[PDB]
């Protein structure tokens, strides 16, 4: 996706450390469909 | 300093009571001018 945008390191971290960061819900399910996002982030809460 | 003394008395003549506001605003604008010259701090940074 990020070809036309200059100054873009792909996979660039926002943390200055190299320790493994537990990924946020949008780092995983960001570029996906809305129903999978709903089942990911309100599935347990809305479950009956 | 003398020019802002004239400016303070000019602000005092359009304030009224007349000569007292002349002298007060002239001395206050004089202190503003002297604070701009000698670098007088009213909200001085804590340094020691």
């Amino acid at each position: 996706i990020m070809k036309d945008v200059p100054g873009w390191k792909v996979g660039e971290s926002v943390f200055h450390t190299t320790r493994w960061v537990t990924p946020m819900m949008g780092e995983l399910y960001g570029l996906r469909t809305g129903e999978e996002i709903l089942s990911s982030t309100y599935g347990f809460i809305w479950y009956t | 300093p003398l020019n802002y003394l004239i400016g303070g008395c000019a602000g005092g003549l359009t304030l009224g009571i007349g000569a007292a506001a002349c002298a007060y605003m002239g001395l206050t604008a004089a202190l503003v001018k002297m604070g701009q010259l000698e670098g007088w701090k009213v909200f001085a940074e804590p340094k020691v």
Partner: protein, 105 residues
């Protein structure tokens, strides 16, 4: 007037709720346990004045772990570029982001 009675007598009245990295029930971690632990171990005992300017990297990593403003900025940038490319018709989404790939486990 900070009469530190809790260090004089040796009682723990409110230190346990103070930070996230303390002893939690059933050893539950916080979301930013490592980042807060590193900011605390960096800035320990050296005072606030040295702690502001000499532990700014760990503190900004911990602030960005809390608020996730740089991560939300990056995801908004990538999602905006993706929306613009889907609008222009120069890009197609993969099958594993459209929902036809029979997820991993």
């Amino acid at each position: 007037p900070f009469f530190d009675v809790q260090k004089k007598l040796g009682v723990d009245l409110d230190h346990w709720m103070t930070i996230q990295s303390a002893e939690q029930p059933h050893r539950i971690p916080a979301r930013c346990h490592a980042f807060e632990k590193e900011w605390i171990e960096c800035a320990h005992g050296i005072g606030s004045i040295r702690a502001e300017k000499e532990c700014k990297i760990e503190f900004e990593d911990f602030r960005e772990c809390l608020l996730r403003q740089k991560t939300m900025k990056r995801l908004n940038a990538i999602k905006r570029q993706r929306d613009k490319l889907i609008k222009e018709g120069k890009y197609t989404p993969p099958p594993h982001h459209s929902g036809q790939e029979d997820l991993r486990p």
